[PDB]
Amino acid sequence: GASIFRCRQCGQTISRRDWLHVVFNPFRVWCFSLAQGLRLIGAPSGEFSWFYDWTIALCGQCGSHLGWHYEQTFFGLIKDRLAEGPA
Amino acid sequence: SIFRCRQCGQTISRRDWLLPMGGDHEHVVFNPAGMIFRVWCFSLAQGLRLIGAPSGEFSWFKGYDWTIALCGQCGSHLGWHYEGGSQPQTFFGLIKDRLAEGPA
Amino acid sequence: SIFRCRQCGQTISRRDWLLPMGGDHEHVVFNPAGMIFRVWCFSLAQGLRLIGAPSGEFSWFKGYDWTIALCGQCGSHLGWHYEGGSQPQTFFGLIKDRLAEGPA
Numbered sequence: 173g174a175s176i177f178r179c180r181q182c183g184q185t186i187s188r189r190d191w192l193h194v195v196f197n198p199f200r201v202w203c204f205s206l207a208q209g210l211r212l213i214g215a216p217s218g219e220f221s222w223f224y225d226w227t228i229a230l231c232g233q234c235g236s237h238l239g240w241h242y243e244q245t246f247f248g249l250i251k252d253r254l255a256e257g258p259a
Numbered sequence: 260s261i262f263r264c265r266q267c268g269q270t271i272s273r274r275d276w277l278l279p280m281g282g283d284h285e286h287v288v289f290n291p292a293g294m295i296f297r298v299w300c301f302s303l304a305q306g307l308r309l310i311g312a313p314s315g316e317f318s319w320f321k322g323y324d325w326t327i328a329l330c331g332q333c334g335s336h337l338g339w340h341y342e343g344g345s346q347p348q349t350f351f352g353l354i355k356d357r358l359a360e361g362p363a
Numbered sequence: 364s365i366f367r368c369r370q371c372g373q374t375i376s377r378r379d380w381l382l383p384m385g386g387d388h389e390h391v392v393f394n395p396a397g398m399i400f401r402v403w404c405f406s407l408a409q410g411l412r413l414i415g416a417p418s419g420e421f422s423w424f425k426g427y428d429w430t431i432a433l434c435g436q437c438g439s440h441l442g443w444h445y446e447g448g449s450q451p452q453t454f455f456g457l458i459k460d461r462l463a464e465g466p467a
């Protein structure tokens with residue numbers, strides 16, 4: 173019962189197990205090769221990248237900030253902004 | 260400082276008994292019926308009635324089997340008891356918005 | 364969106380002013396008389412009238428003193444003002460079911 177990852181606020185499907193780092197801001201971050209249901213916003217930036225340039229990733233449904241897209245490319249999503257459950 | 264059942268006011272647990280499982284006492288989870296719960300983990304609880312036999316199906320906590328926990332007074336579903344794991348062997352996952360916090 | 368007094372319609376607060384105190388803006392609490400309230404936390408409010416002197420007895424929020432907050436227009440009890448803490452110094456806990464949410 174922890175194989176699909178959804179937005180904590182609204183329950184939008186974001187990523188999978190399947191597609192699967194503790195960091196400090198200037199978070200428990202989960203790295204995914206693929207994701208869905210996001211909206212990537214703004215221009216890429218390298219400022220204090222934990223890894224790659226980053227772009228902000230919002231929930232495409234409710235607009236909640238769920239993490240970043242890195243760009244070969246991958247997603248770094250904030251564990252505490254996600255809800256885990258079954259497929 | 261203590262948690263009561265939101266429906267009837269039965270004594271359930273204490274803030275002192277909050278337990279950080281895997282870094283935090285709060286876990287936001289969804290069940291296979293798509294219900295989302297904000298679950299708080301407690302080492303200890305009282306005033307519940309645990310129903311059925313333990314099951315490991317769709318357990319949100321690796322290594323633990325769950326049993327449904329009702330309010331022993333009013334029968335409202337307050338969460339689950341977890342067992343069969345280690346460090347700790349057992350704990351309770353209670354639904355935050357089914358509880359009411361207040362003075363001892 | 365804005366929150367208005369359910370009884371008379373006076374403007375009280377804004378969704379923009381929601382404030383997560385200790386993790387969430389919503390707290391379900393009980394007072395020493397056993398009355399249960401669903402409280403939403405806001406950083407600011409308007410149109411209220413605070414009654415009495417601040418008191419720290421049985422505060423739901425450690426480090427804050429409370430005063431009762433009435434609707435300044437109709438006198439309906441809408442919640443409490445909190446003060447004397449830090450980050451933030453002051454905020455409001457308003458009873459969600461006494462408010463009506465709607466467009467500005």
Ligand SMILES: Nc1ccc(C(=O)N[C@H]2CCC(=O)NC2=O)c(C(F)(F)F)c1
Binds near residue numbers: 317318319325
């Ligand atoms: N029909 C249903 C289906 C699933 C569940 C449910 O929550 N299941 C939990 C059990 C505890 C856990 O660790 N993971 C789960 O998925 C419920 C229930 F809410 F009533 F219990 C009713």
Ligand SMILES: Nc1ccc(C(=O)N[C@H]2CCC(=O)NC2=O)c(C(F)(F)F)c1
Binds near residue numbers: 423424
């Ligand atoms: N007899 C009584 C007893 C207590 C209270 C009460 O609300 N107390 C709150 C005040 C706010 C808080 O942070 N904690 C509390 O315990 C009331 C009242 F409803 F009028 F205000 C009448």
Ligand SMILES: [Zn+2]
Binds near residue numbers: 179181232233234235
């Ligand atoms: Zn969302």
Ligand SMILES: [Zn+2]
Binds near residue numbers: 264266331
């Ligand atoms: Zn009950």
Ligand SMILES: [Zn+2]
Binds near residue numbers: 372
């Ligand atoms: Zn009013």
